[PDB]
Design a protein around this nucleic acid. Structure first.
Ligand SMILES: [Cl-]
Ligand SMILES: [Cl-]
Ligand SMILES: [K+]
Ligand SMILES: [Mg+2]
Ligand SMILES: [Mg+2]
Ligand SMILES: [Mg+2]
Ligand SMILES: [Mg+2]
Ligand SMILES: [Mg+2]
Ligand SMILES: [Mg+2]
Ligand SMILES: [Mg+2]
Ligand SMILES: [Mg+2]
Ligand SMILES: [Mg+2]
Ligand SMILES: [Mg+2]
Ligand code: NA
Ligand code: NA
Ligand code: NA
Ligand code: NA
Ligand code: NA
Ligand code: NA
Ligand code: NA
Ligand code: NA
Ligand code: NA
Ligand code: NA
Ligand code: NA
Ligand code: NA
Ligand SMILES: [Sr+2]
Ligand SMILES: [Sr+2]
Ligand SMILES: [Sr+2]
Ligand SMILES: [Sr+2]
Ligand SMILES: [Sr+2]
Ligand SMILES: [Sr+2]
Ligand SMILES: [Sr+2]
Ligand SMILES: [Sr+2]
Ligand SMILES: [Sr+2]
Ligand SMILES: [Sr+2]
Lengths: 56, 81, 46, 65, 194
RNA sequence: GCUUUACUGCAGGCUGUCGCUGAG
RNA sequence: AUACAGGGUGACAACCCCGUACUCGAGACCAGUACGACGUGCGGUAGUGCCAGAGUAGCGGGGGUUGGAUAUCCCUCGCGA
RNA sequence: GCACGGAGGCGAAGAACCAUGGAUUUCCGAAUGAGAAUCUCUAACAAUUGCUUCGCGCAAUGAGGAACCCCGAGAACUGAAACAUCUCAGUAUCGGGAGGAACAGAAAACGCAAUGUGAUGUCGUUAGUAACCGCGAGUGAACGCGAUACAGCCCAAACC
């Protein structure tokens, strides 16, 4: 069984969903953690300096 | 403070429910319960509500099917608005 | 699937946004719904 | 329009409420006529009713009711 | 004449001798069974506390904090490093234990502000320090001529920014001349080389 | 990437010492 | 014209329109600062070993760091006025 | 309103519009009664603290903000024409935290050694100097001086 097309047919699981906190479809309904804003993981908002060029 | 009754839901299916089953259909606030729909309807048109069925519509609203008592006449009620 | 009440509200909104730019807006602005979505060709959120 | 602020303030608290229930009704019946695709409309009032209600509600809070 | 306080002071110059020795041997048994941060009604070293700003008044709190002894508790490098940055065992942290203690205490009392702290001994596996904290929101303090200063907004979370006496010492700010070229006015402004 | 009695280091284990640590 | 900055107006506009110079008004910041005033009371002589911040000052082992070299700053273990 | 439509309406009861102040301000959100992909279930400062009338009665914290700032954690590519000390660099990135600016700050200073200077930032300079360094590549101050701005005080103890 190929890892490509034939293995894509088995994908019908719902993981990432609209997040209650930020509105992005990044709330992992299995982990109950938003990969975009951090909801469910931290009270503080998810942020990182690498989301932009170092000197900007 | 949100109101319970938004407006009459007037469609072919609604009229049939009105002529044949003495029922009135309303677009109502989706936070309203069957009981709150009954009360509100009685107070607004001075009628007696017998049963209320609800449905959260694909229009983002709640539709209510209100059956009046045999004492009241749907056709005549809706006809005064 | 099984939709919650909230999921259902969002789905409804998406359906409504899927309408056309009223004809009068055409005359008024004297000359497109950039967010036109298709159930098949597209994929909504959630 | 038809209903001015003075008039509203000249009403007693009980009058504003009665006036309020009355305005809400005219509106409700307008939305009914509109839902029924009724043409005997007057797009100006359906709009005025909302403002009138907001006014009474604003006055009610100002006077303490 | 000598203050009664001087006798507490004098006792603590040699915590391993005299009566104080037996007291510590006794106390520590109880301390080892207490938590990380325990509020206490009265300072164990009165002279030191009053000397550091303590007062028997509403809004003044004292808490004993214990911390594990020794150097850094670091995890070995998982990615490539040159011999120099592979060290693990003999590398120590840059903040002394007293400072770590002051911070834990302040976290326990989110509304209070660290005023000062002092050592109350240690055993072979941990160290204890008592921390004086102040309630900047209590009027008994808002009206105190000697402590109301700690009520200013810029004094909020002072311990976390190194504004404590232990903080300032640890930042190499003691000397006003030779040796403080890279510590004053801040470690950061000097490129972090102090 | 992998190997080893290649170079140089780092964990880890064994071992002595000092502190914890007291009385005869 | 104390106005020839700029723009608009069916084409190159000081004088068609907005503005522009001059003069004037208000808010914000300076700042609850300066000045002023209320209270407090500065300072000096003689005598008095009454008081003046300890794991500190300082030393040693091990680390880091620094231009800091014997002579940087810090952490850690031990000793310690 | 953007937005030059149709219909209709508002405005001399002075609308539109603008400034200031006020009213309203759904749900989720630090999110705080419990739970939940923005909804639901049966009175709520949840949690941590201070005070305490020991009752959540009175209060604090939480999260955000372009960067700036303070305290911690801390690389490698790279340079050395290899490479290990060194370098890149206390940089990138991470943890915590304050403000409108931070931090520093009234000498157990300096040491143009003096019959001299006199809290602290910062700017110019001192200077690529002193110092460091497979004494290789490279790293690199300070006192002083000219400026900016200036400001000096409060406890602990003695005695009560
Ligand atoms: Cl603090
Ligand atoms: Cl000098
Ligand atoms: K390297
Ligand atoms: Mg149902
Ligand atoms: Mg449709
Ligand atoms: Mg006094
Ligand atoms: Mg600075
Ligand atoms: Mg909740
Ligand atoms: Mg190279
Ligand atoms: Mg280095
Ligand atoms: Mg070479
Ligand atoms: Mg360097
Ligand atoms: Mg010097
Ligand atoms: Na509707
Ligand atoms: Na689809
Ligand atoms: Na705190
Ligand atoms: Na250093
Ligand atoms: Na040492
Ligand atoms: Na608002
Ligand atoms: Na609160
Ligand atoms: Na309480
Ligand atoms: Na090279
Ligand atoms: Na190479
Ligand atoms: Na070197
Ligand atoms: Na000179
Ligand atoms: Sr197989
Ligand atoms: Sr196949
Ligand atoms: Sr599947
Ligand atoms: Sr979690
Ligand atoms: Sr972040
Ligand atoms: Sr529909
Ligand atoms: Sr498809
Ligand atoms: Sr805070
Ligand atoms: Sr002194
Ligand atoms: Sr001065």
């Amino acid at each position: 069984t190929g890892a490509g097309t034939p293995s894509q047919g088995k994908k019908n699981t719902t993981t990432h969903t609209k997040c209650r906190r930020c509105g992005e479809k990044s709330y992992h309904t299995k982990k109950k953690v938003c990969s975009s804003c951090g909801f469910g993981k931290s009270a503080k908002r998810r942020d990182y300096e690498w989301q932009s060029k170092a000197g900007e | 403070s949100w109101d319970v009754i938004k407006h009459p839901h007037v469609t072919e299916k609604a009229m049939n429910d009105m002529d044949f089953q003495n029922k009135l259909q309303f677009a109502v606030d989706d936070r309203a319960s069957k009981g709150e729909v009954a009360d509100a309807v009685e107070e607004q048109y001075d009628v007696t509500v017998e049963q209320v069925n609800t449905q959260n519509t694909m229009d983002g609203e709640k539709k209510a099917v209100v059956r009046l008592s045999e004492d009241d006449d749907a056709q005549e009620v809706a006809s005064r608005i | 699937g099984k939709k919650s009440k909230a999921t259902k509200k969002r789905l409804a909104k998406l359906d409504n946004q899927n309408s056309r730019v009223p004809a009068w807006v055409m005359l008024k602005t004297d000359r497109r719904n950039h967010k036109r979505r298709h159930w098949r060709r597209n994929d909504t959120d959630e | 329009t038809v209903l001015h602020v003075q008039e509203i303030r000249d009403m007693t608290p009980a009058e504003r409420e009665a006036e309020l229930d009355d305005l809400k009704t005219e509106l409700l019946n307008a939305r009914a006529v509109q839902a029924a695709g009724g043409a005997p409309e007057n797009p100006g009032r359906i709009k005025e009713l909302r403002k009138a209600i907001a006014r009474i509600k604003t006055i009610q809070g100002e006077e303490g009711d | 004449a000598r203050s009664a306080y001087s006798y507490i002071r004098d006792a603590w110059e040699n915590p391993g001798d005299g009566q104080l020795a037996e007291l510590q041997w006794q106390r520590q048994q109880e301390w080892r069974n207490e938590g990380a941060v325990e509020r206490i009604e009265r300072p164990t070293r009165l002279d030191k506390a009053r000397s550091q700003g303590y007062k028997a008044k509403q809004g003044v709190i004292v808490a004993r904090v214990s911390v594990r002894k020794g150097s850094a508790r670091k995890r070995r490098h998982k990615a490539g490093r040159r011999s120099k940055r592979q060290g693990v065992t003999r590398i120590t942290r840059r903040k002394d234990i007293q400072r770590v203690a002051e911070e834990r205490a302040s976290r326990t009392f989110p509304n209070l502000r660290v005023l000062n702290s002092y050592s109350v001994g240690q055993d072979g596996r941990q160290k204890w320090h008592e921390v004086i904290l102040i309630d900047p929101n209590h009027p008994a303090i808002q009206n105190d001529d000697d402590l109301s200063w700690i009520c200013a907004d810029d004094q909020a979370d002072r311990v976390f920014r190194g504004l404590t006496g232990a903080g300032r010492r640890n930042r190499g700010l003691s000397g006003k001349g030779k040796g403080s070229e890279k510590t004053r006015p801040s470690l950061r402004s000097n490129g972090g080389k102090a």
